[PDB]
Amino acid sequence: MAASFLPSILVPLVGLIFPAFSMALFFLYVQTDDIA
Amino acid sequence: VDLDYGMKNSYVPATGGDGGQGQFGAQSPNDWRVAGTSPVGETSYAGAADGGEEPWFAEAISTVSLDLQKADETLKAFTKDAAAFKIEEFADAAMEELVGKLGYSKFLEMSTKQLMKTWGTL
Amino acid sequence: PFPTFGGSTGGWLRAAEVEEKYAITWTSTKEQIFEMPTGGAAIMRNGENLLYLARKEQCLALSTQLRTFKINDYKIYRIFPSGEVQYLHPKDGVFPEKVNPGRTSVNSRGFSIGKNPNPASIKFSGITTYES
Amino acid sequence: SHTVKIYDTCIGCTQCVRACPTDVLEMVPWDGCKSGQIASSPRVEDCVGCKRCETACPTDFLSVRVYLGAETTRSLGLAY
Amino acid sequence: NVQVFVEKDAVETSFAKWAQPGHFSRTLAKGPKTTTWIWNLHADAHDFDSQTSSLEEVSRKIFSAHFGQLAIIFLWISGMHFHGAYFSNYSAWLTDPISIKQSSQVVWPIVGQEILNADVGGNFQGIQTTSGWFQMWRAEGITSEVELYWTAIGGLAMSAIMLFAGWFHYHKAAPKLEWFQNAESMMNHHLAGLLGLGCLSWSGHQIHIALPINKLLDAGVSPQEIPLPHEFLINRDLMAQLYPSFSKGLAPFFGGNWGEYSDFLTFKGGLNPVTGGLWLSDIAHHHLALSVLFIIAGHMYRTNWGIGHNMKEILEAHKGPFTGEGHKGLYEILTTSWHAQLAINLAMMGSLSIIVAHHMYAMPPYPYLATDYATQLSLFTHHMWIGGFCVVGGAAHGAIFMVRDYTPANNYNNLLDRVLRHRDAIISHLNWVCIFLGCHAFGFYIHNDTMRALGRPQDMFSDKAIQLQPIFAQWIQNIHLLAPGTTAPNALATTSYAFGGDVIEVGGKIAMMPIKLGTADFMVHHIHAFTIHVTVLILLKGVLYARSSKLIPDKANLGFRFPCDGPGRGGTCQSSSWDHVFLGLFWMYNSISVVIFHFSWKMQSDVWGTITPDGAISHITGGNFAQSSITINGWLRDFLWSQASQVIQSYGSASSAYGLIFLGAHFIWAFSLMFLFSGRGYWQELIESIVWAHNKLNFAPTIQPRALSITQGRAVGLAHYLLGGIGTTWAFFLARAISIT
Amino acid sequence: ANFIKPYNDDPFVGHLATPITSSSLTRALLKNLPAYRFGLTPLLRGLEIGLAHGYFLIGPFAQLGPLRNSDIGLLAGFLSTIGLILILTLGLTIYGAAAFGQEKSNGSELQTKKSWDQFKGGFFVGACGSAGFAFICLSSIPTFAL
Amino acid sequence: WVTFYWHWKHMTIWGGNPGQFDESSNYIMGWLRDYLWLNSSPLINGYNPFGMNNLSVWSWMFLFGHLIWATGFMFLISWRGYWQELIETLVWAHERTPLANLIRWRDKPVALSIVQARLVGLVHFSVGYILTYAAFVIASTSGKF
Numbered sequence A: 001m002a003a004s005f006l007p008s009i010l011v012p013l014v015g016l017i018f019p020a021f022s023m024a025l026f027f028l029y030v031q032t033d034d035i036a
Numbered sequence B: 001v002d003l004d005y006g007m008k009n010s011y012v013p014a015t016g017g018d019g020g021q022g023q024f025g026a027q028s029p030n031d032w033r034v035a036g037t038s039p040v041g042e043t044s045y046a047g048a049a050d051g052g053e054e055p056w057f058a059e060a061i062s063t064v065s066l067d068l069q070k071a072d073e074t075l076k077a078f079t080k081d082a083a084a085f086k087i088e089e090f091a092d093a094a095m096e097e098l099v100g101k102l103g104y105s106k107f108l109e110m111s112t113k114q115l116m117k118t119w120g121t122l
Numbered sequence C: 001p002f003p004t005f006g007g008s009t010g011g012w013l014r015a016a017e018v019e020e021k022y023a024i025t026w027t028s029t030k031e032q033i034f035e036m037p038t039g040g041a042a043i044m045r046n047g048e049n050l051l052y053l054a055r056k057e058q059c060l061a062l063s064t065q066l067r068t069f070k071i072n073d074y075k076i077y078r079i080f081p082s083g084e085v086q087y088l089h090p091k092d093g094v095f096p097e098k099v100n101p102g103r104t105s106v107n108s109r110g111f112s113i114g115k116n117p118n119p120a121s122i123k124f125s126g127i128t129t130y131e132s
Numbered sequence D: 001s002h003t004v005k006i007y008d009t010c011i012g013c014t015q016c017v018r019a020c021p022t023d024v025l026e027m028v029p030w031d032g033c034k035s036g037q038i039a040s041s042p043r044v045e046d047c048v049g050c051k052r053c054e055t056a057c058p059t060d061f062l063s064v065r066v067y068l069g070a071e072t073t074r075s076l077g078l079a080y
Numbered sequence E: 001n002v003q004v005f006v007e008k009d010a011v012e013t014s015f016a017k018w019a020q021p022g023h024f025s026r027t028l029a030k031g032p033k034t035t036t037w038i039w040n041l042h043a044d045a046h047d048f049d050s051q052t053s054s055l056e057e058v059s060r061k062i063f064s065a066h067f068g069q070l071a072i073i074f075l076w077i078s079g080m081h082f083h084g085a086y087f088s089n090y091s092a093w094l095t096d097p098i099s100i101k102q103s104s105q106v107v108w109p110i111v112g113q114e115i116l117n118a119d120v121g122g123n124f125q126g127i128q129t130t131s132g133w134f135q136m137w138r139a140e141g142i143t144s145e146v147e148l149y150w151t152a153i154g155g156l157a158m159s160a161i162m163l164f165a166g167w168f169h170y171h172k173a174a175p176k177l178e179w180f181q182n183a184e185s186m187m188n189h190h191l192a193g194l195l196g197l198g199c200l201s202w203s204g205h206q207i208h209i210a211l212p213i214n215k216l217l218d219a220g221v222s223p224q225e226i227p228l229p230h231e232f233l234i235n236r237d238l239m240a241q242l243y244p245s246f247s248k249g250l251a252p253f254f255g256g257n258w259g260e261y262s263d264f265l266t267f268k269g270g271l272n273p274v275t276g277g278l279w280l281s282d283i284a285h286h287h288l289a290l291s292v293l294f295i296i297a298g299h300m301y302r303t304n305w306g307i308g309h310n311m312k313e314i315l316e317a318h319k320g321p322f323t324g325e326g327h328k329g330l331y332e333i334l335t336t337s338w339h340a341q342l343a344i345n346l347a348m349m350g351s352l353s354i355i356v357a358h359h360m361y362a363m364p365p366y367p368y369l370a371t372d373y374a375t376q377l378s379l380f381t382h383h384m385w386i387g388g389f390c391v392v393g394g395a396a397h398g399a400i401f402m403v404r405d406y407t408p409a410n411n412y413n414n415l416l417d418r419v420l421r422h423r424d425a426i427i428s429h430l431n432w433v434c435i436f437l438g439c440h441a442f443g444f445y446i447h448n449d450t451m452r453a454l455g456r457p458q459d460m461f462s463d464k465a466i467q468l469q470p471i472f473a474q475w476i477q478n479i480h481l482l483a484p485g486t487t488a489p490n491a492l493a494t495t496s497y498a499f500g501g502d503v504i505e506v507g508g509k510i511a512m513m514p515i516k517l518g519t520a521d522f523m524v525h526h527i528h529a530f531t532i533h534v535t536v537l538i539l540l541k542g543v544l545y546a547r548s549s550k551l552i553p554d555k556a557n558l559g560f561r562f563p564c565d566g567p568g569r570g571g572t573c574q575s576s577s578w579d580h581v582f583l584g585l586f587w588m589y590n591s592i593s594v595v596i597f598h599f600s601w602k603m604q605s606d607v608w609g610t611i612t613p614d615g616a617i618s619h620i621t622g623g624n625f626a627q628s629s630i631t632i633n634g635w636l637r638d639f640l641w642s643q644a645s646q647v648i649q650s651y652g653s654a655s656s657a658y659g660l661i662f663l664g665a666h667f668i669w670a671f672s673l674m675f676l677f678s679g680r681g682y683w684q685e686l687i688e689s690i691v692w693a694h695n696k697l698n699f700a701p702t703i704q705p706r707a708l709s710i711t712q713g714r715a716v717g718l719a720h721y722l723l724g725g726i727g728t729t730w731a732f733f734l735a736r737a738i739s740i741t
Numbered sequence F: 001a002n003f004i005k006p007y008n009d010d011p012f013v014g015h016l017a018t019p020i021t022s023s024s025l026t027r028a029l030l031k032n033l034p035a036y037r038f039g040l041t042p043l044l045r046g047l048e049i050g051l052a053h054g055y056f057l058i059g060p061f062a063q064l065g066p067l068r069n070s071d072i073g074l075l076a077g078f079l080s081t082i083g084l085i086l087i088l089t090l091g092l093t094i095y096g097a098a099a100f101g102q103e104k105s106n107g108s109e110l111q112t113k114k115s116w117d118q119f120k121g122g123f124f125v126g127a128c129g130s131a132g133f134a135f136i137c138l139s140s141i142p143t144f145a146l
Numbered sequence G: 001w002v003t004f005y006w007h008w009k010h011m012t013i014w015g016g017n018p019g020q021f022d023e024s025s026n027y028i029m030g031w032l033r034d035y036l037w038l039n040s041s042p043l044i045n046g047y048n049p050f051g052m053n054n055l056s057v058w059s060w061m062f063l064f065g066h067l068i069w070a071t072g073f074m075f076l077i078s079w080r081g082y083w084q085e086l087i088e089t090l091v092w093a094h095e096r097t098p099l100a101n102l103i104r105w106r107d108k109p110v111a112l113s114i115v116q117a118r119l120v121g122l123v124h125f126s127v128g129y130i131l132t133y134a135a136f137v138i139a140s141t142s143g144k145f
């Protein structure tokens, strides 16, 4: 393992996985009927 | 038939910038957020109409109607206080004379002196 | 007692089934064409007519049009999905534009509009100046 | 729901009531003016906020004031 | 019974009401209390149906106003002829149409503006004009400035006659409403008389005057040696020298041997090789056949002699199982509403203007028009703009009909009623079509820009890559190219060389050559489809939701033109049908702008240019359309940035007026955004502070200053937007085309 | 004579019975599609729908994707199809969570949380398997020559 | 205006010819021709039919900014009532479409509010303005010097 691999590892995680999960979480939070 | 059925909703009026629930209620007591259409033989929500062999247009079938008898009865129920006020100012049997002699809507529409005039006839 | 109408895409939607619906009834003394607020023309029946609409404003627009026909007996109801009815208009049997004894004033403030308090004077109270 | 207030400069001309498209307003007896009536807004749950009532009001400044607030299905004028 | 009913001395002639501004309006008649009054006065001046409830009076006002418009048009034409007669190089241009630049406007020497008098040739200095006057005059047979002077004198006479006729038919002899409601007789006269006799008489002029004069002029005869036009009338031998069948005379016409006239009534097609325009003999045959067709068409409707069709009967019979009552009620609509008629007629006239633009570029009808690239560009662009405005106006007046003249009682279960009954379906499907077209058509360009930027040319939509060939258009082009011998066997050449064939060369410049269609043409045609569909969406929504909607159920009671119904219901700004016209105008501007840019670039890149006697073709922009027009960057760089060179480098030359107008149009376009982006509440509040300053010095108008109304703010913003954008394109096109021609 | 009438003989509902909405073809088709067909378990509805969609979804990726001209173009198209199916499955999952809540479902109707989870799982399996089947079919295209 | 002034004066200084600014800045056509048009050249050729260089990202951002600015015009010019009426037909279409009406929104679709549309138009306008000018200034300065 080397740090030079990190972009091709991390960029898909930051630009695809993270926005998708963040958007799904925000959608679920805004659709929740009782938050508190 | 309850008269505050509209008011008994889940709308909680805010403390500012909100007129609240007025004479009939701010919103329906029924949750509008229901499911979409459903397969043949199934219902999407509790009181949904069975679209039969065409469930995709199930929401175009009416389960909410107003039969004329319910209309007359709710007319009387919702205006019972106004009629009570009109007999209170014109003055049980007298109200039954007036509302059968000329009508209930007409009894609401007339004036206490005018009803004192029509009570002159018998 | 439905008027003679061939239908349109402008009628009520799922809300009429799940949230609320409106009905207007009236008595016509002849068969006459009128304008549906949802688009298109319908033929009133001689006698009682009943019409279902998605909004109260549609019912009142139709009633305003009925007034041009010399028809003043129209009644407007709200119907909930359970089948409960609310008699809405005219609420007391008398049109709101005609003053009626037994009505109580609602939402009056006993001063001219220029006497409402200053916003900075009610900060963090949760109220607005027009409600205090 | 929107807020509709009547101030005591009302002259009971009934123009706001005739202007209202959703029947929010009505005339009630009152001894504060020559006409012997004042405007009232008992049914603010049906107010859409069009402000036709304010357009109709002849006083200076207005005697009926509509303050827009919490939106509902009724106040948004939704047929759906 | 078709009869003439006229009331005499209907309206007094007097200047009293000229001194009472706003007399036509009951409200405006009381005089101004605020500056709003002033604006209202101009807005309601020609709104005749709001000035009176009588249809007869509206008809009379419309008739007289039409005469006034005709007088103005005659004045304009007469002025053009007078400028040709006294401020032009027409005589010099006649001798050498190729090297002399047409010019019919001269400027006075003042503040240095005389630089605008370009060295156009022919011992003449002036402005190069692009409206095609010289080509039209040469096609008519005009060879001298004296003929132009007489045409101008007649134009003045006709202008005065139209003005008197308008005064007479308003104030002295005003027809009754029953006269106006004569659709059958009006159609019979306008088809047979106006169109048929017009075509027949113009064919007479072309056969007797224009044809021999142009045959001589093409043959190289000097204009000063060509016989005067009346000699061709009084000397059948003069015509027999040119067209031998004139030595037979009219005997073949009444004998039926019309083939004898084949020498001057032809079906050649193509273009005249000397002039680069259509053969005048083809044009004469065309006008003669059209005259016959129109005269026939003008006997269809019944007036007074039993025979003929009743329009109401025909309309009433056309109904089917999908359409209820069908066309019943339409006749009553179109004979009682001026707005319904105007909607139809504006739609038709605008579409016709667009058609004119296309047909006049592809089949150039006048001599030496095809190689006058400035004139071709200006005529195409001008007629495109006129057509766009007229189609939008037709939409607007349809909306006005819906608001004001539509009656539910007269439209029960007919086509109009059923359209109103499925407006939601219509608008939802049109909305989806617009999204589909926009996404795909514009996404092609966006995809291409991204691919080229990423260094992936092989992934683009292009001819050299993933291809989008307009195969249907190509199939049609091939069919039209093969037509002359087979499906039009009597045609000697193609209707237009744009479909295929040789290159038509005039003076070393290309008049017309085949216009090939590839991937770039596919993309741009789908952009055109997209913009038109969106414009239709806006305007059809304005018509179908003019009376009511789920948002505002009583829109018709608010009228055609109102700013809004208040901030309630979420906000109702621009819900009126006038606002739909307002938005449709922006979209029409977008559409026509794209169409004229497509024309300009495609013609410069693939059609226009020079051609050596050997055969080597050098196009104006070197054929860059195919690979540059497939990205937005290519339009920004290879079209706008590159072709703006002439307009921005024009200072200090005869084209400097174009650079100035380019800048001023940019300025007015940006100035419009102040009105379009803001609202009158702000401006009224600012005016309060300014009125304060005036009051602080003891003076202020009793006509209290007011910010423009909401609707006037929108109207002003849009008017300046259109003026600015269109004028910018105008200056840019004119500088570019004068350089390249 | 009249091929349009109000839907359900109700003039005031916003719908019309036309040949498009109410022809025998339309009714037979719609009643037989797995989203509506009587008697299917939610899992089987999901499975049939996934099988239908995953098969055609591979085509655009295989034939037009960036690696279409490489010899692993089909494999890349399959991978792209699987990624699209995962995106759609996330959509279905969060949709079910929003539309039905997280409480235990009281019924077996498709428009319930447990049934929708079954339907979503069936869709994922059907779509991925169908993309794989299309990959196999596209690995060897028959010319149909005797 | 401020940054245009700074940039043009510095570009003419850096280019060795201050006299071009000194003479052409006195009329608007000088700004349009000698500042914007003349200095657009390396930016608009970051990619073209012949290839691309490292300025292609700025060319793309330039067009991106123009597009965002123009899209902001839509919110600024067209107002709410039109859009609300259109969205009404969209709701009708979705409720009446088989296999799509299996799915329903839980938040009723409405047009953006009056103030919200002003803000959205302003944000699009501002972002487009900034991105367009940043691309121009960076690309023109770096592709020339």
Ligand code: CLA
Binding pocket: A006, A007, A008, A010, A011, A012, A014
């Ligand atoms: C806040 C400043 C900041 C910004 C804008 C970026 C931006 C970037 N980083 Mg870098 N990174 C940062 C700080 C930052 N980094 C720090 C402090 C470290 C040391 C831990 C790193 C370690 C790092 C590595 C190893 C790599 C990147 C890479 C990248 C690029 C791709 C994104 C990615 O996959 O990273 C993944 C980032 C992380 C795993 C750690 C992120 C740590 C920062 C502090 C998160 C910042 C949160 C932020 C402030 C929240 C506010 C923003 C929001 C409100 C909009 C992108 C240019 C990739 C690259 O260079 O591709 C060519 C890459 O391989 N970053």
Ligand code: CLA
Binding pocket: E075, E076, E077, E078, E079, E080, E082, E087, E105, E106, E107, E108
């Ligand atoms: C078709 C429209 C038209 C247009 C746009 C032009 C335009 C022009 N003409 Mg041409 N012309 C025309 C028709 C037209 N003409 C016609 C029909 C004739 C035959 C009469 C001529 C005969 C002609 C000649 C002989 C000459 C021109 C010239 C010109 C140029 C200078 C005009 C000028 O500044 O005069 C001066 C402008 C004024 C004095 C402005 C006065 C405006 C009045 C006062 C306002 C009117 C408003 C309203 C009607 C009145 C209300 C108040 C009232 C009741 C008191 C200009 C390009 C000149 C030229 O080309 O020079 C090289 C020139 O010598 N024209």
Ligand code: CLA
Binding pocket: E077, E131, E132, E133, E135, E136, E194, E195, E349, E350, E352, E353, E356, E366, E379, E382, E383, E386
């Ligand atoms: C603001 C309106 C406007 C203006 C300023 C112009 C200006 C011009 N037009 Mg254009 N035009 C317009 C609207 C306008 N047009 C519209 C709406 C149409 C569609 C009908 C046309 C169709 C048209 C044609 C066919 C021609 C022009 C030409 C011209 C140029 C010469 C002017 C002239 O006197 O030619 C006089 C016109 C002719 C000599 C030809 C007229 C032939 C048409 C078919 C006659 C139709 C008349 C008919 C009765 C109209 C009723 C239509 C019917 C369906 C009811 C000038 C640039 C001419 C040109 O470009 O010359 C270089 C030219 O040939 N125009």
Ligand code: CLA
Binding pocket: E042, E043, E044, E045, E046, E047, E048, E342, E346, E389, E390, E392, E393, E394, E396, E400, E560, E561, E578, E581, E719, E723
């Ligand atoms: C046959 C052509 C025709 C006719 C006879 C009419 C007639 C009418 N229109 Mg219609 N309309 C038309 C075409 C026509 N229109 C077209 C092509 C459009 C699309 C643009 C429209 C769109 C339209 C709208 C939106 C409205 C009308 C309205 C009207 C009515 C009022 C007219 C008025 O009082 O304005 C008075 C005339 C003016 C105030 C002049 C305006 C000047 C314009 C805006 C700019 C001129 C620019 C100039 C040429 C360039 C100068 C450049 C220089 C300064 C550098 C009248 C019935 C109004 C109505 O209420 O109907 C009942 C209305 O609201 N029209």
Ligand code: CLA
Binding pocket: E431, E432, E434, E435, E436, E437, E438, E439, E440, E442, E443, E446, E534, E537, E538, E583, E584, E586, E587, G067, G070, G071, G072, G073, G074, G075, G077, G078, G082
């Ligand atoms: C350049 C600026 C701009 C843009 C992009 C738009 C875009 C649009 N306008 Mg608007 N408009 C504009 C200026 C603009 N307008 C201005 C200045 C005004 C004031 C006059 C208006 C007034 C107006 C009216 C009155 C109407 C429109 C309508 C529309 C829509 C047309 C339907 C369509 O094609 O959608 C397709 C989308 C596009 C064409 C935009 C980009 C498409 C991309 C390139 C391809 C697909 C990408 C995809 C979504 C992936 C995105 C990835 C992302 C998640 C990262 C479209 C969204 C109409 C409408 O809504 O009809 C349904 C409509 O009626 N506009």
Ligand code: CLA
Binding pocket: E439, E440, E441, E442, E443, E444, E446, E447, E450, E459, E460, F057, F060, F061, F064, F065, F066, F067
């Ligand atoms: C909107 C127009 C548009 C179109 C048609 C394309 C097309 C393409 N893009 Mg491009 N692109 C676009 C805009 C567009 N792009 C935009 C706005 C951007 C951002 C700037 C890009 C950025 C981009 C990149 C970075 C790449 C592409 C690539 C591609 C290619 C592969 C895409 C793919 O496989 O999708 C898959 C498609 C689907 C899964 C479904 C397509 C839709 C189906 C077919 C509709 C079917 C409906 C049906 C007929 C309805 C009825 C059916 C029945 C039941 C009745 C393809 C040629 C890739 C490439 O390599 O190009 C060569 C690539 O790497 N694009």
Ligand SMILES: CCCCCCCCCCCCCCCC(=O)OC[C@H](COP(=O)(O)OC[C@@H](O)CO)OC(=O)CCCCCCCCCCCCCCC
Binding pocket: E318, E319, E320, E321, E322, E323, E324, E326, E327, E415
């Ligand atoms: C290529 C041009 C543009 C094509 C657009 C869409 C291509 C799809 C094919 C549609 C053509 C046939 C339409 C039905 C066939 C047709 O021509 O009419 C057939 C039929 C006519 O019915 P009847 O026989 O009752 O007609 C009696 C007549 O006298 C009318 O009174 O019309 C209908 O059934 C309703 C028409 C609405 C049908 C809506 C279909 C979708 C329309 C698409 C929008 C059209 C755009 C054009 C606007 C100007």
Ligand SMILES: CC1=C(/C=C/C(C)=C/C=C/C(C)=C/C=C/C=C(C)/C=C/C=C(C)/C=C/C2=C(C)CCCC2(C)C)C(C)(C)CCC1
Binding pocket: E077, E151, E152, E154, E155, E158, E197, E198, E200, E201
């Ligand atoms: C350009 C111009 C102008 C001029 C115009 C003109 C010059 C015109 C002319 C026109 C003409 C000059 C016309 C003519 C007409 C004619 C006609 C249209 C005729 C017809 C006829 C027929 C129909 C025939 C028939 C017959 C026969 C066949 C046989 C037997 C006998 C008879 C005779 C019956 C003016 C000044 C206005 C100004 C503006 C521009």
Ligand SMILES: CC1=C(/C=C/C(C)=C/C=C/C(C)=C/C=C/C=C(C)/C=C/C=C(C)/C=C/C2=C(C)CCCC2(C)C)C(C)(C)CCC1
Binding pocket: F051, F052, F053, F055, F056, F125, F126, F128, F129, F130, F132, F133
């Ligand atoms: C008919 C018709 C039509 C339409 C068409 C279409 C649209 C079609 C489609 C089609 C399709 C769209 C198809 C699909 C197919 C699919 C398939 C064929 C699938 C299969 C699959 C499989 C077999 C799989 C399996 C599996 C699983 C499940 C799991 C594990 C793995 C495996 C692989 C074993 C139209 C309109 C034109 C009209 C005419 C007629």
Ligand SMILES: CC1=C(C/C=C(\C)CCC[C@H](C)CCC[C@H](C)CCCC(C)C)C(=O)c2ccccc2C1=O
Binding pocket: E674, E675, E676, E678, E679, E680, E683, E684, E706, E707, E708, E709, E710, E712, E713, E714
């Ligand atoms: C600038 C602007 C104004 C202010 C502009 C006004 C009031 C126009 C002023 C027009 C002048 C007064 C008429 C023409 C007169 C000349 C400019 C000066 C000559 C002065 C005298 C000879 C009359 C609005 O009122 C407005 C309203 C609604 C939306 C947008 C806007 C808007 O953008």
Ligand code: SF4
Binding pocket: D006, D009, D010, D011, D012, D013, D014, D015, D016, D017, D038, D039, D053, D056, D057, D058, D059, D063, D064
């Ligand atoms: S509030 Fe205004 S409009 Fe209403 S009654 Fe009072 S004075 Fe008249």
Ligand code: SF4
Binding pocket: E563, E564, E565, E566, E567, E568, E571, E572, E573, E574, E679, E710, G079, G114
């Ligand atoms: S006053 Fe202006 S901002 Fe307010 S609703 Fe009307 S048009 Fe919109």
